[PDB]
Scaffold this active site. Structure first.
Site, mmCIF file in Angstrom:
data_model
loop_
_atom_site.group_PDB
_atom_site.id
_atom_site.type_symbol
_atom_site.label_atom_id
_atom_site.label_comp_id
_atom_site.label_asym_id
_atom_site.label_seq_id
_atom_site.Cartn_x
_atom_site.Cartn_y
_atom_site.Cartn_z
ATOM 1 N N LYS B 41 0.815 -1.213 0.000
ATOM 2 C CA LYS B 41 0.000 0.000 0.000
ATOM 3 C C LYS B 41 0.849 1.264 0.000
ATOM 4 O O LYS B 41 0.366 2.343 -0.337
ATOM 5 C CB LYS B 41 -0.996 0.003 1.168
ATOM 6 C CG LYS B 41 -0.390 0.102 2.567
ATOM 7 C CD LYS B 41 -1.498 0.111 3.615
ATOM 8 C CE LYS B 41 -0.978 0.327 5.026
ATOM 9 N NZ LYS B 41 -2.129 0.570 5.948
ATOM 10 N N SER B 47 7.724 2.122 4.039
ATOM 11 C CA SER B 47 7.282 1.131 5.033
ATOM 12 C C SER B 47 7.841 1.459 6.403
ATOM 13 O O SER B 47 8.915 2.054 6.518
ATOM 14 C CB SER B 47 7.737 -0.276 4.643
ATOM 15 O OG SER B 47 7.310 -0.627 3.342
ATOM 16 N N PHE B 122 22.624 -3.351 24.599
ATOM 17 C CA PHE B 122 21.198 -3.126 24.411
ATOM 18 C C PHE B 122 20.409 -3.799 25.527
ATOM 19 O O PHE B 122 20.913 -4.700 26.199
ATOM 20 C CB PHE B 122 20.763 -3.650 23.036
ATOM 21 C CG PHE B 122 19.868 -2.707 22.274
ATOM 22 C CD1 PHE B 122 18.500 -2.941 22.187
ATOM 23 C CD2 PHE B 122 20.397 -1.590 21.633
ATOM 24 C CE1 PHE B 122 17.672 -2.075 21.482
ATOM 25 C CE2 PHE B 122 19.572 -0.718 20.922
ATOM 26 C CZ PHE B 122 18.209 -0.962 20.850
ATOM 27 N N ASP B 224 -3.489 -4.597 8.850
ATOM 28 C CA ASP B 224 -4.311 -4.972 7.707
ATOM 29 C C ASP B 224 -4.266 -6.468 7.379
ATOM 30 O O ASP B 224 -5.254 -7.029 6.902
ATOM 31 C CB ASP B 224 -3.931 -4.124 6.496
ATOM 32 C CG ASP B 224 -4.112 -2.631 6.747
ATOM 33 O OD1 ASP B 224 -3.221 -1.850 6.350
ATOM 34 O OD2 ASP B 224 -5.138 -2.236 7.343
ATOM 35 N N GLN B 243 3.693 -4.276 23.345
ATOM 36 C CA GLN B 243 4.893 -3.697 23.950
ATOM 37 C C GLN B 243 4.852 -2.181 24.079
ATOM 38 O O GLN B 243 4.707 -1.461 23.086
ATOM 39 C CB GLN B 243 6.163 -4.095 23.194
ATOM 40 C CG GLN B 243 7.425 -3.564 23.868
ATOM 41 C CD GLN B 243 8.691 -4.234 23.396
ATOM 42 O OE1 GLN B 243 9.177 -3.974 22.293
ATOM 43 N NE2 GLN B 243 9.250 -5.090 24.243
ATOM 44 N N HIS B 245 7.224 0.641 24.631
ATOM 45 C CA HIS B 245 8.616 1.074 24.632
ATOM 46 C C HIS B 245 8.794 2.151 25.697
ATOM 47 O O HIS B 245 7.989 3.079 25.778
ATOM 48 C CB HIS B 245 9.024 1.619 23.267
ATOM 49 C CG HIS B 245 10.497 1.841 23.123
ATOM 50 N ND1 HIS B 245 11.326 0.938 22.496
ATOM 51 C CD2 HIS B 245 11.290 2.863 23.526
ATOM 52 C CE1 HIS B 245 12.567 1.391 22.519
ATOM 53 N NE2 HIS B 245 12.571 2.559 23.137
ATOM 54 N N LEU B 255 9.681 7.684 18.584
ATOM 55 C CA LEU B 255 10.607 6.788 19.256
ATOM 56 C C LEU B 255 11.980 7.412 19.435
ATOM 57 O O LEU B 255 12.579 7.895 18.475
ATOM 58 C CB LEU B 255 10.756 5.475 18.491
ATOM 59 C CG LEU B 255 11.759 4.532 19.155
ATOM 60 C CD1 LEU B 255 11.053 3.513 20.026
ATOM 61 C CD2 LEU B 255 12.627 3.854 18.119
ATOM 62 N N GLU B 258 16.356 2.776 22.291
ATOM 63 C CA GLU B 258 16.933 2.104 23.454
ATOM 64 C C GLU B 258 18.460 2.155 23.373
ATOM 65 O O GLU B 258 19.147 1.966 24.375
ATOM 66 C CB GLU B 258 16.429 0.655 23.506
ATOM 67 C CG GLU B 258 16.824 -0.170 24.734
ATOM 68 C CD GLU B 258 15.804 -1.259 25.051
ATOM 69 O OE1 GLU B 258 14.657 -0.901 25.388
ATOM 70 O OE2 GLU B 258 16.140 -2.464 24.969
ATOM 71 N N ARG B 289 12.033 -4.409 28.420
ATOM 72 C CA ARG B 289 11.213 -3.268 28.038
ATOM 73 C C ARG B 289 9.932 -3.165 28.860
ATOM 74 O O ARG B 289 9.462 -2.062 29.145
ATOM 75 C CB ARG B 289 10.911 -3.299 26.540
ATOM 76 C CG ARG B 289 12.162 -3.218 25.688
ATOM 77 C CD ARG B 289 12.077 -2.061 24.716
ATOM 78 N NE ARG B 289 11.621 -2.464 23.389
ATOM 79 C CZ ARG B 289 12.339 -2.343 22.274
ATOM 80 N NH1 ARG B 289 13.563 -1.818 22.303
ATOM 81 N NH2 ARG B 289 11.817 -2.739 21.122
ATOM 82 N N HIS B 356 4.352 0.422 20.934
ATOM 83 C CA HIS B 356 5.497 0.332 20.039
ATOM 84 C C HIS B 356 5.501 -0.886 19.118
ATOM 85 O O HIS B 356 5.570 -0.743 17.893
ATOM 86 C CB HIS B 356 6.773 0.363 20.872
ATOM 87 C CG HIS B 356 8.025 0.209 20.075
ATOM 88 N ND1 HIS B 356 8.427 1.133 19.136
ATOM 89 C CD2 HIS B 356 8.980 -0.750 20.095
ATOM 90 C CE1 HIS B 356 9.573 0.746 18.605
ATOM 91 N NE2 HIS B 356 9.930 -0.394 19.170
ATOM 92 N N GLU B 389 6.346 -8.437 11.906
ATOM 93 C CA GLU B 389 5.534 -8.015 13.051
ATOM 94 C C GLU B 389 4.075 -8.476 12.918
ATOM 95 O O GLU B 389 3.374 -8.673 13.924
ATOM 96 C CB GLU B 389 5.619 -6.496 13.233
ATOM 97 C CG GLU B 389 5.012 -5.960 14.535
ATOM 98 C CD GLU B 389 5.126 -4.439 14.687
ATOM 99 O OE1 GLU B 389 5.631 -3.764 13.763
ATOM 100 O OE2 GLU B 389 4.701 -3.911 15.737
ATOM 101 N N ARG B 400 9.134 -8.700 23.763
ATOM 102 C CA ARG B 400 10.158 -8.708 22.729
ATOM 103 C C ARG B 400 11.442 -8.052 23.208
ATOM 104 O O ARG B 400 11.414 -7.021 23.879
ATOM 105 C CB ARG B 400 9.666 -8.013 21.460
ATOM 106 C CG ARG B 400 10.683 -8.064 20.340
ATOM 107 C CD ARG B 400 10.364 -7.123 19.207
ATOM 108 N NE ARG B 400 11.562 -6.394 18.826
ATOM 109 C CZ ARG B 400 11.673 -5.072 18.821
ATOM 110 N NH1 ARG B 400 10.638 -4.298 19.138
ATOM 111 N NH2 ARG B 400 12.829 -4.525 18.475
ATOM 112 N N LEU B 406 14.050 -6.487 13.791
ATOM 113 C CA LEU B 406 14.748 -6.350 12.519
ATOM 114 C C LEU B 406 15.402 -7.683 12.153
ATOM 115 O O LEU B 406 15.489 -8.045 10.969
ATOM 116 C CB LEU B 406 15.769 -5.210 12.550
ATOM 117 C CG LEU B 406 15.248 -3.766 12.581
ATOM 118 C CD1 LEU B 406 16.397 -2.781 12.449
ATOM 119 C CD2 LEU B 406 14.181 -3.484 11.533
#
Ligand code: FAD
Ligand code: EPH
Ligand code: HEM
Ligand code: SLI
Ligand code: SF4
Ligand code: F3S
Ligand code: FES
Lengths: 239, 613, 102, 138
Positions: B41, B47, B122, B224, B243, B245, B255, B258, B289, B356, B389, B400, B406
């Site tokens: 779309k 994206s 992280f 969707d 989640q 964040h 955002l 982190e 998180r 998030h 996702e 998560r 990613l």
């Protein structure tokens, strides 16, 4: 109470023989986010849902909302509204593009031009790929700063007069900066033939350094300077 | 319906979604010789995955020495034992191979002393299975790693003859007798309707962050694919697991990575104390998180807010060297100034827990195959795959891990292609759909195009977004959840009453956002009902009436002579959700989590334990 | 590939610096030799200049043809005219000199 | 589908459609850098016209140059009007020359930031006026 006026370019392709016109909307800024897109969304949601525009991230990284606000190409989600009430914001689609509807321009040619420079890493022997990470030094990496960040919002190219008069055969700053992005990426083995692709009077050489591109880039990047750096490589590379 | 041009397309495979996952699957299929269409779309670069910031986890061992099994442990420990360990095994082992693959594609990762990929500390990660301290395995392109991941992926995808349907809004799945046959899509550019049929369909449409009033996600994160699956009568999974964040900006809810905390950034209350030292002694502000953001939401309640209305908390950065902030985090350096008027080098950012990531989604194999639930047993839906996702292989479970999505994308995008490439052949019989199939999707489109009701699309979306925000927040209780439930249900009956204005064909955004609303509502209903039924505190879902982590065993004490709880007496299970599209009724079921890995000898099953950081 | 457009671009800048050098050089040293080189440098740079303007604005097939030929004519006529002026008259340098002390 | 094909389908679509072009010059905000580039084209074109008219008239018109000077001496009864002729001649030449140097410096890769364009641009503007007034009186 604090009303601000907006003048927006409208055109509905579905109406019989409608021609392009401006339409005025008015917004209380005390019930509105600070950015132009916030207004656009607000008038879309509350006043006129016939208003059509591209948007996704509201953050300034997707590049969807690129348009001409007050005579300059930027991102609506990133430009804050001029709080001066006496002035009226003039919103327009990106210049010299075919208007699909309202503020939505056909960027198909722009995307195709991007495709025509092969924006991906090319190696002479790709039989070893996907197993060893390629080495690139910190310095070789800095050369990509101010080039990889490009959003493909099309603000720059769509502000270049050369891109207006010759959008068909001239690639424009956005696409040109990307060819340069891959030229100086130390991991790319196809530098010479990437320069050889621009060996005609139109692809690169319609740039006459008007420098609107750099002046308008919402991300602070410098496409015209990259163009200048290409022109130099073009004259100096041998064989 | 004779008022609409119906164009039929014939392909070996269709990928719905041009995100990270979408693309990787898309061109991964074509690379293996499959005539593939990618239906999206947005233009692929637009994206959401461009918004990505933190990085991409892989146990490359570039900073200190690493092991992917340690990464495994951290993910399942992070998942709060709702994560399906077979999928987590597959992912964390593939992690390095997948990341190297990207770097070889052209991704401009930040570099080290050695010239290798720069890895970042992280939230949630450790060495030596929890024992060895803080792990540095977040591969990153400075602050903009998602942006680069998406661009080099799109860049790469141009080398193959994949057929892209750019700015086409997929409506429903082409379903026939329990098998997927493709997708029916609206072409946004001219209003025409396209039945794109294939042997295999890959749903990779990302999350539904826009069910809430405040979120890091895009205006186009509207679930969707989930809605498509729901309208097919197929179940969704773990949809209540949303989640929050910890560090979203106070203003527009953007955002702030982190990665700030991973570089050395600190969370501060109105007193000046590093408050995350009071909630997690070991990991501090680099914890889970759910643990971090819930600690924040709690500090606000006590009276320790920070603004003129005392509702947020500070993310301090000005103590890190300026040169570090410039090289590591220039992208949040920009948006903190742009959106909050904040010089990061001098002042702290106003941050707040905001929606998030959606760990819930379409139930999935480690192979990326969509599962329906028949007779309390798992069953593969023929010709239907899901990744990213949008999916739920539950690689993430109840919470998560930062910089794992990613990864999720690239790993399972790849997996979907491989599951297809290895099951059938390109040029195999593409199953012929019924002459007038996908009819009800078109009829839905037509009724929404002329909707002459009392409540306008934007107003109903707002009612939904605010209602989810106050009833399904960081903390949730029985009473508040129940009122939320019959409130969302009421707003579903309100779909009859919606007013639409644009009656055109070309770029009717008024219309598509109304399709988006139907989609969001189905995601909302299943989220809120599933949430109220779950009477435990696990991962992101924290109940204040049932704060106990309810398993088959009490895992605090030794395992020996304990009475093992029957399946319908504990909550260590996946929430499967259906909605009867007509009455808007939610009926739910459950399936077990997967504990056995792909090979015990290579990767030992980590049993449930006391879970704190 | 043959690098025609890059050489052309280089040539343009080389005659630009040549012309920039020639204006001070013509003033400091006005002579027969400086007259001819000022005619060559002058008409060439201008021909290549108008070249670009034609290239940018002349949209068409047989039009791009004509405008380019039409320029080639006007340029050739210009360079001849200047060379004639240098040979059978006072030549650019002295001619400017007279015009100015008017 | 190739890149070359996407372009043919872009043009065949939009030319055979009733889609309007979004306004460009009409709407775009004027900046000094921009206005100065048009001037360089204008001065370029004007200076070519000057050289070409001067050359062609050395072939098409009768009598020597000094003969044609005696014709300019005849017409004139004005003192400062000769200066206006000299200032009007030398002004476009000086502008193009200075801004030409600015162009050649650009081609070397230098001075290509937005602050530098304003600075270099203003320095060119000031240099034109001085050398134009400077040469006109000789
Ligand atoms: C919100 C967010 C998430 C995020 C992040 C930063 C932000 C602001 N940073 C991350 C990070 O640093 N590291 C990491 O591991 N994860 C990070 N995340 C989470 C993660 O990025 C997301 O989960 C991920 O981006 C999801 O990607 P996915 O490939 O699954 O899909 P998408 O990016 O959301 O894009 C959706 C695509 O599907 C198409 N689409 C959607 N609906 C339709 C319909 N109706 N019809 C046709 N196409 C559809 C979109 O066009 C798009 O291509
Ligand atoms: C095509 C040409 C068409 C002719 C018209 C264009 C004239 C414009 C040029 C103006 C340049 C200023 C010259 C000032 C001057 O008087 O020179 C000194 C002259 C006095 O003696 P002196 O030697 O100074 O005397 C010393 C005693 N004190 O002696 C010289 O040195 C003259 C040389 C100047 C050469 C410049 C030629 C540039 C042509 C540009 C054409 C632009 C067209 C528009
Ligand atoms: C010695 C002084 C001069 C210098 C340094 C100079 C330099 C330049 C340069 C560098 C350009 C190209 C700029 C670009 O990249 O777009 C240019 C354009 C041009 N010049 Fe000159 N020039 C000088 C004198 C002249 C003269 C006397 C004429 C008269 C024939 C002239 C005619 C033109 C024309 C017609 C153009 C085309 C404008 C364009 O490129 O679009 N120039 N000049
Ligand atoms: O400066 C322009 N062109 C140009 C071309 C070649 C060399 C210098 C400038 C220009 C600027 C705005 C609008 C239209 C134009 O042609
Ligand atoms: S250089 Fe700037 S204006 Fe051009 S495409 Fe990139 S972000 Fe957009
Ligand atoms: S606006 Fe232009 S002509 Fe070149 S310097 Fe930038 S592309
Ligand atoms: S909408 Fe993403 S750039 Fe404005």
């Amino acid at each position: 109470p604090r009303i601000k006026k907006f003048a927006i370019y409208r055109w509905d392709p579905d109406k019989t023989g409608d021609k392009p016109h401006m339409q005025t909307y008015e917004i209380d800024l005390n019930n509105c986010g600070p950015m132009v897109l916030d207004a656009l969304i607000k008038i879309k949601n509350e006043i006129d849902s016939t208003l059509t525009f591209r948007r996704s991230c509201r953050e300034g990284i997707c590049g969807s909302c690129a348009m001409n606000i007050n005579g300059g190409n930027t991102l609506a989600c990133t430009r804050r509204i001029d709080t001066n009430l006496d002035k009226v914001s003039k919103i327009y689609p990106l210049p010299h593009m075919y208007v699909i509807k309202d503020l939505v321009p056909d960027l198909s040619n722009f995307y195709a031009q991007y495709k025509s420079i092969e924006p991906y890493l090319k190696k002479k022997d790709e039989s070893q790929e996907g197993k060893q990470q390629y080495l690139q030094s910190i310095e070789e990496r800095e050369k990509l700063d101010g080039l990889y960040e490009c959003i493909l919002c099309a603000c720059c190219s769509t502000s270049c007069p050369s891109y207006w008069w010759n959008g068909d055969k001239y690639l424009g700053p956005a696409v040109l900066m990307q060819a340069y992005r891959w030229m100086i990426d130390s991991r790319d083995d196809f530098t010479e033939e990437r320069l050889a692709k621009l060996q005609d009077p139109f692809s690169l050489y319609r740039c006459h350094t008007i420098m609107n591109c750099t002046g308008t880039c919402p991300k602070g990047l410098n496409p015209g300077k990259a163009i200048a750096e290409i022109k130099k490589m073009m004259a100096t590379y041998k064989e | 319906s004779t008022q609409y041009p119906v164009v039929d397309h014939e392909f070996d495979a269709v990928v719905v979604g041009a995100g990270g996952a979408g693309l990787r699957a898309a061109f991964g299929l074509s690379e293996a010789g499959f005539n593939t269409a990618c239906v999206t779309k947005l233009f692929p670069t637009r994206s959401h995955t461009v918004a990505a910031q933190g990085g991409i986890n892989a146990a490359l061992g570039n900073m200190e020495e690493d092991n992917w099994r340690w990464h495994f442990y951290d993910t399942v420990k992070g998942s709060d034992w709702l994560g399906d360990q077979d999928a987590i095994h597959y992912m964390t082992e593939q992690a390095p191979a997948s990341v190297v693959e990207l770097e070889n594609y052209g991704m401009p990762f930040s570099r080290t002393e050695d010239g290798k990929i720069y890895q970042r500390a992280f939230g949630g990660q450790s060495l030596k299975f929890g024992k060895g301290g803080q792990a540095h395995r977040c591969c990153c392109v400075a602050d903009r790693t998602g942006h680069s991941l998406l661009h080099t992926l799109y860049g790469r995808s141009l080398r193959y003859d994949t057929s892209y349907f750019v700015e086409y809004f997929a409506l429903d799945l082409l379903m026939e007798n329990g098998e997927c046959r493709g997708v029916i899509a609206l072409c946004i550019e001219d209003g025409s309707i396209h039945r794109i049929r294939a042997r295999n369909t890959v749903v990779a449409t990302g999350g539904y962050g826009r069910t809430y009033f405040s979120c890091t996600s895009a205006h186009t994160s509207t679930g969707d694919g989930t809605a498509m699956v729901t309208r097919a009568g197929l179940p969704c999974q773990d949809l209540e697991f949303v989640q929050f964040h910890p560090t979203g900006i106070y203003g527009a809810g953007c955002l702030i990575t982190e990665g700030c905390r991973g570089e050395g950034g600190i969370l501060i209350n109105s007193q000046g104390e590093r408050f995350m030292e009071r909630y997690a002694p070991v990991a501090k502000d680099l914890a889970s998180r759910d643990v971090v953001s819930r600690s924040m939401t709690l500090e606000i309640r006590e009276g320790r807010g920070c603004g003129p209305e005392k509702d947020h908390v500070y993310l301090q950065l000005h103590h890190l060297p300026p040169e570090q902030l410039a090289v590591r985090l220039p992208g949040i350096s920009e948006t903190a100034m742009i959106f909050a008027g904040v010089d990061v080098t001098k002042e702290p950012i106003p941050v707040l827990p905001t929606v998030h990531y959606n760990m819930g989604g379409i139930p999935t194999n480690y192979k990326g195959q969509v599962l329906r639930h028949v007779n309390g047993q798992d069953q593969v839906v023929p010709g239907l795959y899901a990744c990213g996702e949008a999916a739920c292989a539950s690689v993430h479970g109840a919470n998560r891990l930062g910089a794992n999505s990613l990864l999720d994308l690239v790993v399972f995008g790849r997996a979907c292609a491989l599951s297809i490439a290895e099951s059938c052949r390109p040029g195999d019989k593409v199953p012929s759909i019924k002459p007038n199939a996908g009819e009800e999707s078109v009829m839905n489109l037509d009724k929404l195009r002329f909707a002459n009701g009392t409540i306008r699309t934007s107003e109903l979306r707002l009612s939904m977004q605010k209602s989810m925000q106050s009833h399904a927040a960081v903390f949730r209780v029985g009473s508040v959840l129940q009122e939320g439930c019959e409130k969302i249900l009421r707003l579903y009956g309100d779909l009859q009453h919606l007013k639409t204005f644009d009656r055109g064909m070309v770029w009717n955004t008024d219309l598509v956002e109304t399709l988006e609303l139907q989609n969001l509502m189905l995601c909302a209903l299943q989220t809120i009902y599933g949430a109220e039924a779950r009477k435990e505190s696990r991962g992101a879902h924290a109940r204040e009436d049932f704060k106990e982590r309810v398993d088959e065993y009490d895992y605090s004490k030794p395992i020996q002579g304990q009475q093992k709880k029957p399946f319908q007496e504990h909550w260590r299970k996946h929430t499967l959700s259906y909605v009867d599209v007509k009455t808007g009724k939610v009926s739910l079921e459950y399936r077990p989590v997967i504990d056995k890995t792909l090979n015990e000898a290579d990767c030992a099953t980590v049993p449930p334990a006391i879970r704190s950081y | 590939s043959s690098k025609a457009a890059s050489l052309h671009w280089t040539g343009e800048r080389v005659v630009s610096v040549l012309l920039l050098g020639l204006l001070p050089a013509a003033y400091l040293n006005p002579c027969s030799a400086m007259d001819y080189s000022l005619a060559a440098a002058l008409t060439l740079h201008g021909h290549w200049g108008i070249g670009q303007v034609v290239t940018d604005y002349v949209r068409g097939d047989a039009l791009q043809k004509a405008a380019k030929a039409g320029l080639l004519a006007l340029s050739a006529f210009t360079f001849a005219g200047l060379c004639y002026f240098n040979y059978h008259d006072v030549g650019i340098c002295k001619a400017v000199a007279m015009l100015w002390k008017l | 589908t190739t890149a070359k094909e996407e372009m043919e389908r872009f043009w065949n679509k939009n030319l055979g459609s009733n889609r309007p072009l979004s306004p460009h010059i009409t709407i775009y905000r004027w900046s000094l850098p921009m206005a100065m580039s048009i001037c360089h084209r204008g001065t370029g074109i004007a200076l070519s016209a000057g050289v070409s008219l001067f050359g062609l008239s050395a072939l098409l018109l009768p009598g020597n140059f000094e003969s044609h000077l005696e014709l300019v001496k005849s017409l004139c009864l004005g003192p400062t009007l000769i200066y206006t002729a000299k200032f009007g001649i030398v002004f476009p030449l000086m502008y193009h020359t200075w801004n030409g140097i600015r162009h050649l410096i650009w081609d070397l890769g230098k001075g290509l930031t937005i602050p530098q364009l304003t600075q270099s641009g203003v320095v060119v503007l000031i240099l034109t006026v001085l050398s134009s007034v400077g040469l006109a009186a000789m």
